[model samples]
Target: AAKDVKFGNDARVKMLRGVNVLADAVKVTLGPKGRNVVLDKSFGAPTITKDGVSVAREIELEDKFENMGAQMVKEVASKANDAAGDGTTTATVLAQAIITEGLKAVAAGMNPMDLKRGIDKAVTAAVEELKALSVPCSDSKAIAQVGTISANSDETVGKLIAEAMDKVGKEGVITVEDGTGLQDELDVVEGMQFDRGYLSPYFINKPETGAVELESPFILLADKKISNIREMLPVLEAVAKAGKPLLIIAEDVEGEALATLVVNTMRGIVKVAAVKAPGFGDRRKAMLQDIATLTGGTVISEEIGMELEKATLEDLGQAKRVVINKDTTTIIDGVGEEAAIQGRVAQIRQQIEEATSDYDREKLQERVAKLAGGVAVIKVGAATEVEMKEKKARVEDALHATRAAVEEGVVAGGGVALIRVASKLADLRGQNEDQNVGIKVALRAMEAPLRQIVLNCGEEPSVVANTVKGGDGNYGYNAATEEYGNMIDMGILDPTKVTRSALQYAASVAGLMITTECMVTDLP
Candidate 1:
């Protein structure tokens, strides 16, 4: 491949163009009255979505240099989504504003390093102010409000998420799935779930769901790693003869053992899936025992004189169903007696009481909850498959935003929180003139989200921004109502963590782009 390299302003301008392109595509979906973007597809129906990260993920420029710039902003958006669950559009918009201004200052002969330092200082102060402005979110009403705003003001999704959070507390697990009917539904299943998923994709039995689901499966618990299939032949043959699926939970299954299992599954010779057991060392041993007790199985441990070769059908545990995805495994309706389950719960609670350290106690309590608590599954339903996919995305975002709100509370929505924080950075000084310019760049960038939101509502952005900036705390425009009022009172809010993460990530990425002096790509 031949190389194409551009230096200084030439490189910066191309990258900035790419940043603007992606940001423009995403900023349209910034607020409650945001517009849906129709993403073109090569097959089937085009996707209509208001989700920021989804739009960001679909863009690809023909120019490699421009594509590189777009991908960088896309990464920042993805990072915000991964860290805070929402605010991806806000992050993208902020990045574009900062980079656009920062590049202009660079072209005007300002020092890039000094400008970056100023940006860093302004972002730190903005994050602190955002933290102070946040109010605690404790009740169900507040959680629903946060969820509603994140889900594009859909009250149904907001309430459904709030109900899920209510049923399963803050630390509990919640999952979303597509429903078969036109109306949404919620169901709580008492089960033991762990953070380990299938070892290979070939184990997946449900292609539509992209998961491995076993019905009335037998579970094998191993305390040590299994790398050879020789020792496990007895149990594998027995499971095959019974014409039932088998789930293997072990320290790890590797090399020949894993390959054989995948082949066997593909050939329909045996129905088997494997996952690494949760925890480590002593904790691993205890957790294995816990699962064994929960599912009526014996842990195949060498210390206990239990060998894989000698293990029988009687030694394996049983569950009504098992679902394994990429990052989690859930076993539903274990065959273990109710008395045994209760006894294990009691033992864990006693351990929690005896635990001296807070960390230890928390871990102990988590074990008890896994054994006793329930998992809430929200079934998102719609009249069509397209609507269902879009609705499910909204529900997932709402769920994440609600969880973040519960963790660190919420602030004024419609981007007012950042605007307020921006006002505080006006007097903040860096070491020199160039650095001060960088600070000004970030300050201006902070208002971009609010401005974009207003623009999308077909309102004068400057008029609304100037008015909101002139008002007191939590007082801002509500685009949905086309009225100005206290944001909290109007039930328009966002999680503090989401706002903080978006600002920090946007500034970080934009600052890097500003200092960049050259770009390289392959020959076309």
Candidate 2:
């Protein structure tokens, strides 16, 4: 990677073109009246989706350099989707609009730094103003309102998630899985999910497989912490020589040990997956027992821990089919007795209740939740494959949105939060030029969401924006009812914290796109 040839302003133009293309592509898929994209593949059936991530993920460009920029802008949407569970299309659209416009100032000899300063100020103001407009939404019904907006007006999907969250309590976690079963139904069970991924891409045997099943990845369940690679060498060497993949479950894996495992996996010399064990102290001990019971693996004791340097194959746990995915691992088809584990579950529950000390109880509770927290499975079902795809996506969106809103609360939706910033920016834009350059530009950009939203509803952007802006505060245009009224009264609301996050991230991304002119790529 030497100092390669740069595309310069030509590259900048190409990049802008690509970004606008993606924005326009995503813009069409916003709101309830939004158009669906049929993404066709050469070897597979075409996918019809309105999900911004799915839509953005499908976009590929012929111009390599511009593809790089467009791909960066697309990442803004992914981040927005993860952070807010919805509004990714709005995020992608806003970033492109701002950068598309902001590049004009740069071309006209305005200092990039000066414009960046202005936009930075405006973004901060927009974010703070959005927070000011926040309202509480902790109850299930109240939170469902936020979910409905996130799900793009799918009220049934919204209601299901709201009910699920309220049933699970604050500490409970929600997980979404593909259903080959019946209609969207919730079941409260005992379990928890952790965010973890396989250590190497090679571990992925099936690209389309949601759960990668391993019949015999040698399980090294360690209760004691392995802080050094030297301590893990014997086990790694044994596995490397034994011609088997390894799964390491430990209290901790760190520094050189983690690196060695990752490097070995990368070099194709060994396959290793590691995860932190659930709890601490007595709780940790309890979890070790449960895992031992289920997997038929003896949990190593720190006091009399199985020495890593001298452990044998028999010391390792035998797994039937270990399932690993991006966010979780499920150990099923185990070796131990079901009734024994059932009795153990009861004992663990009793220990959680009987612990008198705060530290003891808190530790036990954390462990128990990880081991036995109730899980509600909301089965998304439809009569046809087409309906299933869309309905399932809708349900997933509702679940994530409700979960986020439950955690952070919400504010006015229907672009009401956005319009408030636009109106405020209008006041500031008229006062000064240099001081308000970014705000002046972002002012119009802020209204783009509302404008595009109205246009998506088959209405004129100018008329709707003007009518809403002309009215007093809280007034917003609802695309659903085709009415202009107080947004709060209309039940048009959004997750307050998430909307601001989307705005802040989008503005930051736009700033990067407008300022970065050099494009160097070697496309495959």
Candidate 3:
């Protein structure tokens, strides 16, 4: 039989290199103790902190043949990034494992489709294993851990965070500060906090004490833009005439408007008049100070809205006037006294950062290299204890759906249902098949570190051999816990499952599409 096919050594070499590159990218962000990668703005201005999606999104591939695979990797990274805002690294690694192993079956003359089927089976097994390993803690405890883990470790810091959680609600927000000796430490603000809608810090850059001693019903302008000022002016005038204090947030204040608003308040034309402009960048720090000076108000830049609404008017006496702008948004009100008590919290964070040793950097670098990098915490909460239990179950389901995608890689949403219907192909040459060989080579490529994980788990060599031969479906092991589990099981521990699935589908589709093409000229 005559064959009208093109097969060459060079083609195989290129393919192998492509696979290796993909594997390298996947390996970067692996463990919890992994370090962060700081890329300068000069390097395409993409600033990433050890998140797999961030790394994948930033990487730009130049090789045409590898582009499809690279894009697949990125897709997985992105999915993982979105699902939990973490776990890009793990997802990428899993996808790489699939591709590498599947390619081996293809090289061994088994149909690629059959190898794909085997992979599907393996992935399913892996996912089941992942579910078995997880420990679902209580919602309150989980929330507490999340806050505690994310916050700077201090004696009272955890308590403060819990209090903030109580006041803000779990979904409201959570933040951690690595102190840099800045003026404002931590802040929680209620109401909408604007960042940069307008251009000035205060209504008119006036003194902070100007608004003090205002009568009842003080109006606080929190909006950041000036475009709506005209619309708000009439409302302010009406409120002013009704003997209410009027606080306006106007980014730009003409000298005349400033005189009118300020002089009027001084003459009692209005119970109290305060105007503020949008503050930009570090300029906000100064803006808050100015607002304080002009209105006898407290200027909070770090945590802004939390205290404003919760505290009573009398409790706000210390903050008789408060100038809040985009820059000063984080300053939490009522928490100032607490912040003072916990002043050492800031210093501790600073120390933590400074104490981050070379070993830490190396570890982080290794982690950044291993998997899609990022961190995400999934939280389940409920008002009542019974409701909390229900929410936990729902969260588990959500977690399962999430893990499946990361482990096996996912197809596009509507197309996912179609995957079950697709026929599985096998490697044609078995052990001798070129593509099957490639796939084996890929599997071997992953063996080193994977074995280390098993070893770390304290599994005997004989046991490892037996497990591998027994077809138990467990492929990877978790070094941290020193336990042997399947890949999906490990993946669920991270947040990058979505990204892994998306990337896998992208690669599979692209590879299939290109493989079906009869000739170069027929491609387009």
Give the best candidate by TM-score. 1
Better of 1 and 2 by lDDT: 1
Q: Arrange candidates by TM-score, highest first: which order?
A: 1, 2, 3
- Of candidate 1, the 10-residue stretch with the lowest lDDT total is 169-178
Listed per candidate, the RMSD to the true structure in angstroms reads 3.6, 6.4, 19.2
How do the residues 1-524 of candidate 3 rate in per-residue lDDT, one tens digit apiece?
A: 33233243333334445545755654544443344565557758756575455556666557654554466456645655554434455445545655555444445555554454434343333334334433343244443333332232221333444454455543343333222332223344322222332123333333432112222334443323333244345544565455555554434445455555555655756643344444554444433333232222343222454322232222221222233332332112212233332333343334346656876555434322211111122233435556444533434333343333334433221111111112111122333344444333333322333332343345543455334334333343344544445533343232224433433443443244223322111121
Model 3 gets an lDDT of 0.39
- Ranking the candidates on lDDT from highest down gives 1, 2, 3
- Name the candidate, 1 or 3, with the larger TM-score value: 1
Q: What is the lDDT of residue 207 in candidate 2?
A: 66
For candidate 3, the clash count comes to: 105
lDDT of each: 0.87, 0.72, 0.39
After superposing all C-alphas onto the true structure, candidate 3 shows an RMSD in angstroms of 19.2
